[PDB]
Amino acid sequence: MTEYKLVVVGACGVGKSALTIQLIQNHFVDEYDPTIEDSYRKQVVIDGETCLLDILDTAGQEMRDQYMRTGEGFLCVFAINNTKSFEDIHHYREQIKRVKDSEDVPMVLVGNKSDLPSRTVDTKQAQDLARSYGIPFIETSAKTRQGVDDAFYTLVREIRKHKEK
Ligand SMILES: CCC(=O)N1CC2(CCN(c3nc(NC4CCN(C)CC4)nc4c(F)c(-c5c(C)ccc6[nH]ncc56)c(Cl)cc34)CC2)C1
Ligand SMILES: Nc1nc2c(ncn2[C@@H]2O[C@H](COP(=O)(O)OP(=O)(O)O)[C@@H](O)[C@H]2O)c(=O)[nH]1
Ligand SMILES: [Mg+2]
Numbered sequence: 467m468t469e470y471k472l473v474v475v476g477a478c479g480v481g482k483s484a485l486t487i488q489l490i491q492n493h494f495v496d497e498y499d500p501t502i503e504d505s506y507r508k509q510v511v512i513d514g515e516t517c518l519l520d521i522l523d524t525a526g527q528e529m530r531d532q533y534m535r536t537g538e539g540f541l542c543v544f545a546i547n548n549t550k551s552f553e554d555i556h557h558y559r560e561q562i563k564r565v566k567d568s569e570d571v572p573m574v575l576v577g578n579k580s581d582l583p584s585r586t587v588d589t590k591q592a593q594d595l596a597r598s599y600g601i602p603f604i605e606t607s608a609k610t611r612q613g614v615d616d617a618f619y620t621l622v623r624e625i626r627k628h629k630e631k
Contacts, residue, residue: 468515468631470622473522473533475558476543477551481578484608485543486523489618494609501526505533512622515631519618534565539572539625541617544592546577546585546605552592559599572624573601576617581607 474482483498490508503525509518522533542558544551555575562571575596577587589605596603602620606613625631 467509467518469518469520470625470631471520471522471533471536471538472541472618472621473524473537473539474541474543475524475562476541476576477545477548477554478525480543480545480548480551481606481608482541482543483523483525485541485576485578485606485614485617486521488608488611488614489519489521492611494611510619512619517622519622521618531565534562538629539574539621541574541576541621543576543578544587545579545582546587546592547579547582549586552577552587552595555595570600570628572621572628573599574617574621574624575599575601575603576606576613577603578606578608580605580612581609 474486476482478500484495486506487495490506504523506521507518540562542555544555577592592603604613604617606617
């Protein structure tokens with residue numbers, strides 16, 4: 467069983483906890499406690515490989531540098547109806563680059579809440595940013611579970627592309 471250490475980063479309220487809960491439990495949580503920062507496991511077969519995913523759901527206030535230093539891949543999450551959350555991505559990416567001392571860190575940009583009407587961040591802005599960074603862009607809904615598996619599996623794939631597993 468190969469382990470993958472994943473970290474989910476991004477602003478409060480973008481749906482980090484809700485995505486993580488969906489992947490594991492196939493349940494959408496309407497409110498999940500914003501101060502619960504924890505680590506979750508999921509055994510999944512991806513491309514004929516039994517993976518044990520170790521997902522840190524970041525939370526709390528602004529041991530951290532430990533998961534950040536050793537995490538193999540990062541989900542950088544904004545909400546499509548939260549312009550500030552999107553603007554914040556630059557900071558998360560910068561800081562991840564710093565800790566890894568690398569422009570090439572396995573990462574996926576996730577634009578969540580795709581079910582909500584009238585996005586304030588359009589797919590073009592999100593694609594432009596992902597392209598600049600050399601990373602995939604995936605739109606999700608934790609509410610409906612759409613793109614949720616795609617985000618996490620694509621991250622596992624970006625990790626493999628970077629390093630032997
Ligand atoms: C509602 C509760 C919830 O859901 N939360 C998730 C939550 C968001 C706030 N968080 C962070 N915020 C800020 N800074 C600010 C100031 C100005 N900007 C523009 C935006 C935020 N920096 C952060 C940061 F640098 C890192 C980080 C990175 C990337 C890389 C290596 C690292 N080593 N050590 C920290 C760190 C991490 Cl991991 C989080 C925050 C932490 C975790 C709280
Ligand atoms: N419509 C909708 N609401 C969502 C989605 N993801 C999360 N939410 C809601 O947005 C709020 C913040 O979600 P949460 O998962 O706690 O975000 P976090 O602060 O980044 O962990 C919660 O009320 C969720 O129910 C989504 O895809 N769609
Ligand atoms: Mg949370």
